[PDB]
Structure formats: structure tokens, C-alpha cells
Amino acid sequence: MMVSFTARAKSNVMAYRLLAYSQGDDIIEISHAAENTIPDYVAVKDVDKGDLTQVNMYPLAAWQVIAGSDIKVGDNLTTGKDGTAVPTDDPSTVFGYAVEEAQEGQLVTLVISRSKLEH
Amino acid sequence: MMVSFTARAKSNVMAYRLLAYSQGDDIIEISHAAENTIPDYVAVKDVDKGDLTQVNMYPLAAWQVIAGSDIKVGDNLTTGKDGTAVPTDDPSTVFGYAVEEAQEGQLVTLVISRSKLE
Amino acid sequence: MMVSFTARAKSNVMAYRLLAYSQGDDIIEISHAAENTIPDYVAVKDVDKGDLTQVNMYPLAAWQVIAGSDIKVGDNLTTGKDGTAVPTDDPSTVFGYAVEEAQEGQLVTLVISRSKLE
């Protein structure tokens, strides 16, 4: 159950980083989601600025994202720098919670959820 | 692993049209979502009025629907006629935005507002 | 994609009951969701208090859950007692709506939704 569309990278996109969709010229542009925002989707490949890319979207349950800092199992997560995922406690910016442990730079597996886990 | 349910078409349903769920006697019913309403899902096959179907619903951030008129990238979309997707200027009726161009009758891909990301 | 992780039961958990997740000591802890709360998932097997268990979470838009009382198609559902699903009128507590009927104690199928049907 995959749905695909073509996009243009408006800035360099690295694999396993959170993505924002934006209005380009006759095309959707993708870029790393901004810090402390709710992402639109997640990248699974690296795209160079200005290149076309096929964005394949899958049913939502869990995402694999690079950790922007140390993440503990059960942390609530928001967007960090460069489209990474980082812990937060601001409920209005949470988009998921970690179910694996990850040091900064490692791939974290998170469950998509706009509600925080009770700590 | 998928959790399915039986549904009955309240009226004739066409593949890749927007659907609304409604209560029936011992059956959830499906029909094309009404003009300018927020849809519940999208049909995968034709279902004649009165016939049953197994709904295999996925939580998606993007849908593919038949365009009811010409659509430009980024247009905000609501339900048109016969369960199609069309642009609108009324924010309270929008359920997603187009991520590609489509002419009337062409499949259009769109990104949903009311997903697990809302 | 689905995810599989190892959790610890904070309390006794029964098959097809609503679950709440909480943060434990570098592990997710599970227990029956509390009455009138929004659950995080549903158990597929009994788990004794203190035991580790393998949770497999799939991309599902519908769940199967034990009914806490008689449920009719279209009922908006919240968490009842002992992790069961019951009808409710409080919009703040709804987590889905029934798409099949179920007597108390049987399995009901529901579509996940923070909004009431219609």
C-alpha cells in the first residue's frame, strides 16, 4: 500500500531525516523539517538540492529517524536540528515517542503519536 | 496483520472515490462522501448499492482520489461531485492538499490533514 | 512500517483489552488503559504483572477490542473498566466508533478516531 509522487529538493535532504512539504514552482518541494515543528513525512534516501526525487509514502505506524541527541526508550520526540529527532516535553510539538534507545547520530525507531507518553 | 470490517454500500460506489461511513442496522454503510464534506476514506473497488465489501482501512498520510476538476499542486481540496476531489476556498471543508497536478478525471495524490500527524 | 519492541507489564493485562503505555526504566511499560482515557494500543495476549512481552504494532486504522457493555454500530467509544470499550457521549473521551455490533464481553471492531462518527 504505497503512494508515490514527484518532488524537488529545495535544499539537501539526508536519509532518515524528517521532512517538510512546501509549495514550489508547479511542484512540491521537500526539505528537512524545521526544528520544533511537526514533520510532514520522513526521508528514506538522500536527495541533492534542486534534484527531482520520487517520494514513496507508506501506512503510518513507526518511523526510523536519526537522533539529534541521546534518546531514551519512552522519550517524547520532536524535530531537532537538520531534520533529526530529539526529546522534548512541549506537548504541542510532539509527533511520536521512542521505543528504542539511540545515541546522537544513531537511528531511533519511534511510534507516530501526537500525544505524549506518561513519564 | 490487518483489521478489516464488513460494510454495505448505501448507494453505488466507484473505485477511487471519497467515502463516508454511516450507521446502519447491524452494518456500517458506505457511500460517496457528500459535496464539501470531510471524507472518512477512499474506495478501492466498485460496490453496487446493497452489496457488501470488506474494508481494509490503513492509517495514511497521503491518499489518491479521482479529480473532479482541474487541480494544481498545493491546491486545498474538498469533496466534489460523485466522491471526487476538487479545489476549494473554504478552509472548514478542506481535508488535504494536492501534491501533484491533475486534470478532471485523473487520479490525484494528496496529503491529508487528519492523520496520526494532525 | 510496523515496529516490534519488548515491554514490561506494569499490571496484569488480558487479551484484546485496551493498553496504555508509560515510560519505565529504559523500557516501555504496559497496563490496561484507565477508564475514559485514550488508549495507545490493544493487547493480543495475556501478560502477567512483571513479565516482559514482545509488542508488535502494525499500521492499523481499525482495532478489535473486548466490549465492556452492549455496543451497536456507530456507537462512539471510550475506555471502560478493565481495559474494555464502552459507548460514550463525551467527545473529549472518544477514541473511535464501532463498525460492528457486540454484546458485552464479545469482540467489537472499531475505527480509530478522536471525532465521533458524523
Author numbering:
A (entry chain A): 1 to 119
B (entry chain E), C (entry chain C): 1 to 118
Study authors write:
The bacteriophage ϕ29, a representative of bacteriophages with a short non-contractile tail, has an ~19 kb dsDNA genome encoding ~20 proteins. Both 5ʹ ends of the genome are covalently connected to the terminal protein gene product 3 (gp3). ϕ29 infects the Gram-positive Bacillus subtilis cells by injecting the genome–gp3 complex into the host-cell cytoplasm using a short non-contractile tail, leaving the genome emptied virion on the cell surface. Here, we report the cryo-electron microscopy (cryo-EM) structural studies of the ϕ29 prohead, the mature and the genome-emptied virions at near-atomic resolutions up to 3.2 Å.
Each of the head fibers is a homotrimer of gp8.516,19, which consists of a pseudo-hexagonal base and a protruding stem with a unique three-stranded helix-turn-helix supercoil structure. We also determined the crystal structure of the N-terminal pseudo-hexagonal base (gp8.5 N-base, residues 1–116) to a resolution of 1.8 Å by molecular replacement using the EM map as a search model. The crystal structure shows a similar homotrimer with a β-strand missing from each gp8.5-N-βA domain of the trimer. The results showed that the N-terminal 110 residues of gp8.5 form two small β-barrel domains (gp8.5-N-βA and N-βB) connected by a short linker (residues 58–61). The two small β-barrel domains are similar to each other.
